[PDB]
């Protein structure tokens, strides 16, 4: 029984910022989702495929695990057919999303007394995102008539902004580590079973 490596997917020391969410493939292993479901240490565990209890009996051919860190307020945005700054500029799920989402508070880890400076989110983008889209280029944003010409200025903005993760902030403004599992079935022998 060669178990799938959810360990370093959920227990990693560092997660990437939301605008460059990690995408780690899971395949050719047996996954024991029960310990995840029975962990009872997850603030949010919302499933949009099959019910969490049953999926341990359901087998797939690929499990993408996309990890990042967000604010508590935006947690709701990670759901199929949702709208908002995170769900159009940074990361949004397709409506027919076949998988589900784990998230837990991590203020003890990912916030600084002076405010954290590492985690960044894409404030502006000239268009919405395709499903499961990952854009990291950071050309200056032209919010006005003039072309910014590659330099900031009046109504020119750097398209990334830094969350001020401070430990004493409210629950709405606390850092939450988020994992998203997409279970897809392609025309290939299923390898990720119970």
């Amino acid at each position, epitope marked *: 029984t060669n178990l799938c490596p959810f360990g370093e997917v959920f227990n990693a020391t560092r997660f990437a910022s939301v605008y460059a969410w990690n995408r780690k493939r899971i395949s050719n292993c047996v996954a024991d989702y029960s310990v995840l479901y029975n962990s009872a240490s997850f603030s949010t565990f919302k499933c949009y495929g099959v019910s969490p209890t049953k999926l341990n009996d359901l087998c797939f051919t690929n499990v993408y695990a996309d990890s990042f860190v967000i604010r508590g307020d935006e947690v709701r945005q990670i759901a199929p057919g949702q709208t908002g700054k995170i769900a159009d500029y940074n990361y949004k799920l397709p409506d027919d999303f076949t998988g589900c989402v784990i998230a837990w508070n991590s203020n003890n880890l990912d916030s600084k007394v002076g405010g954290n*400076y590492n985690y960044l989110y894409r404030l502006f983008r000239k268009s919405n995102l395709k499903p499961f889209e990952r854009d990291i280029s950071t050309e200056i944003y032209q919010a006005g008539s003039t072309p910014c010409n590659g330099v900031e200025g009046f109504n020119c903005y750097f398209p990334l902004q830094s969350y001020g993760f401070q430990p004493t902030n409210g629950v709405g403004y606390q850092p939450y580590r988020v994992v998203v599992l997409s279970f897809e079935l392609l025309h290939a022998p299923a390898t990720v079973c119970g």
Partner: antibody
């Protein structure tokens, strides 16, 4: 033991872009924050930016406009493309590394590796 | 940004001496300061991290202390090989700031 060795062009022309490349051997880009710093001749060290392996970057606000840091895990290397080069960038550049232990924020640089020279003039 | 200031712009002494370098901040930096040394023609090393810990592989003749907005890095016993330019640096806020250097002869 992380053998770190820079490799970039030793001379560029004004107003074009320069592109250094950092190679790491015996090193696991897989979890450390990697950063570039520069030293003008006879001045202090200037930090430029640091890059995670996924693509999560962060740049110095003064130089935020014209830098571009890329990471290539498969060939385990770094690209630093600095555009709009001026005479003020005549300096050596270093390819540092976080020390490790942290949660959500880098630490002091640890593994500088020998810095290469970059001359920008005509 | 943040302003580092090293009190000794330059310094000299003889072998086996105790020397002190003072790094003062423009605002509160709890312990997020590290001490590097640089011999000429070489990439800087790391000597002290988090303002108090000596990094593995470094001879124990160095030490560090401080908090708030002031810290000190001290060589208890100077050596002929300790000829170098020393830099304090913070990592508490962007951008990271390096002290303008202290030459030690």
């Amino acid at each position: 033991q992380v053998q770190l060795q820079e490799s970039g062009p030793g001379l560029v022309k004004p107003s074009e872009t320069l592109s250094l490349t950092c190679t790491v051997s015996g090193g696991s880009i897989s979890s450390y924050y990697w950063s570039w710093i520069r030293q003008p001749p006879g001045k202090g060290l200037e930090w430029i930016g640091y890059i995670y392996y996924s693509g999560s970057t962060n740049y110095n606000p003064s130089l935020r406009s014209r830098v571009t840091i890329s990471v290539d895990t498969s060939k385990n290397q770094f690209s630093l493309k600095l555009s709009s080069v001026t005479a003020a960038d005549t300096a050596v550049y270093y390819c540092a590394r976080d020390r490790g232990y942290s949660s959500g924020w880098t630490d002091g640089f640890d593994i500088w590796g020998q810095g290469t020279m970059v001359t920008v003039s005509s | 940004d943040i302003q580092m200031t090293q009190s000794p712009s330059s310094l000299s002494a003889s072998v086996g001496d105790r020397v002190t370098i003072t790094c003062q901040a423009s605002q509160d930096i709890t312990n997020y300061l590290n001490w590097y040394q640089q011999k000429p023609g070489k990439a800087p090393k790391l000597l002290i991290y988090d303002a108090s810990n000596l990094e593995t592989g470094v001879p124990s003749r160095f030490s560090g202390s401080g908090s708030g907005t002031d810290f000190t890095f001290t060589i208890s016993s100077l050596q002929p090989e300790d000829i170098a330019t020393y830099y304090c640096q913070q990592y508490d806020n962007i951008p990271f700031t390096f002290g303008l250097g202290t030459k030690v002869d």
